[model samples]
Target: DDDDKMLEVLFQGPGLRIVWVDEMQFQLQSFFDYIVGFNDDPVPVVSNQHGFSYPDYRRITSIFNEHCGRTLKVNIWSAKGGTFRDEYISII
Candidate 1:
């Protein structure tokens, strides 16, 4: 039983759109399922998964767009905060 209204991470890449809080969490969990356990989840995509505000969106686009092929470690906790763990992307 974890708490809420805490800081969270959201990823943005040149060809990705990880705008939701849970989406990034699930992705990080699934991506690192080999090293970690008890976080069984799958893709739960949606149209309106509570995206960021216009300001946030603009900020994200600039960061990811300029990087081109880089997906750096980024975070954004909303006004009410979003409980999430550190993000780590894994792929082969």
Candidate 2:
């Protein structure tokens, strides 16, 4: 399902880096997840203060230019902010 197209987008995402997630007394999964992809996913949620529950934490915004799956990019933001916690999964 447009996997090729998605990959192209990933490559063009600009700035890719490897990330490591530490687990219980262990370092697990040292791989690259596009900063743009990460930023795009986990759709924004609304809050009274910030207007969005989760600010576009661009702290690590320059990380990777990768595309694991094509169809996984379905987490688009909604009008009043959307909850994407369940729609997205942590990549390896």
Candidate 3:
């Protein structure tokens, strides 16, 4: 629903690159599930150590930026007409 907005927030860093996933629908679903855990789970789990305890996009991105080179943008794309089109697709 708000993929573009999410992409906008992701594309606010130094280095810019694109990632393409072969199974994006499944990949995105996995991501949704992962992030959903952040809010739904009351206690920190093995996967989620910080235990955000809320669905805070900024917080997630902020933490990611801190760990990485502070230069990572992610964009999801699932369209047609490409030089070498694959099944799943995502840009990072």
Candidate 4:
């Protein structure tokens, strides 16, 4: 059930591995959950109103390397249309 929660999130939006074109919108909560799981750490939720401390660029890069064997891309522009609007991230 726990894994299902994570899986539900990945396939829901902004997932690097799996995703549903229609279902995959922009969901920060889902992204946060995945990041916490990816790092096995209690990463807090960040938002425009608030902010995230852990899983900053440095920590996220490390987590990515440890889990996916590579760093997550930080493209400035989105390939679909305009600039990269999605601000997804992992945590430590």
Supply the TM-score for candidate 2.
0.24
Q: Rank the candidates by TM-score, best first.
A: 1, 4, 2, 3
Q: Residues 1-90, candidate 3, lDDT per residue (tens digit)?
A: 344443333333433233344357454643221111112221111223443222345555554555453333333333332122112212
Give the winner by lDDT: 2 or 3.
Answer: 3
lDDT per residue (tens digit) for residues 1-92 in model 1: 12121111122212223442455766564332111101222112223345531223554445446556643443323333433333433211
Clashing pairs counted in every model? 0, 5, 7, 0
Each prediction's RMSD over C-alphas, in Å, is: 12.5, 14.6, 14.9, 12.3
Residue range 1-92, candidate 4, lDDT tens digits: 54445333334433243221223345432322123244333222223323222223565446566646333432222223422222334423
Q: For model 3, which pairs clash?
A: 17-92, 19-90, 19-91, 19-92, 21-88, 22-88, 24-88
Q: Provide TM-scores for the models.
A: 0.27, 0.24, 0.21, 0.26
User: Can you list the residue pairs that collide in candidate 2?
Assistant: 16-63, 16-64, 17-63, 17-64, 45-53
Task: Using TM-score, give the best candidate's number.
Answer: 1
Best candidate according to lDDT: 4
Give the per-residue lDDT of model 2 (tens digit) for 1-92.
33333333334333322222225314433332322234343322223343323323343232222434332333222212322221344433
In candidate 4, where is summed lDDT lowest over 10 consecutive residues? 44-53
Model 1 deviation from the true structure expressed as Cα RMSD, one decimal place: 12.5
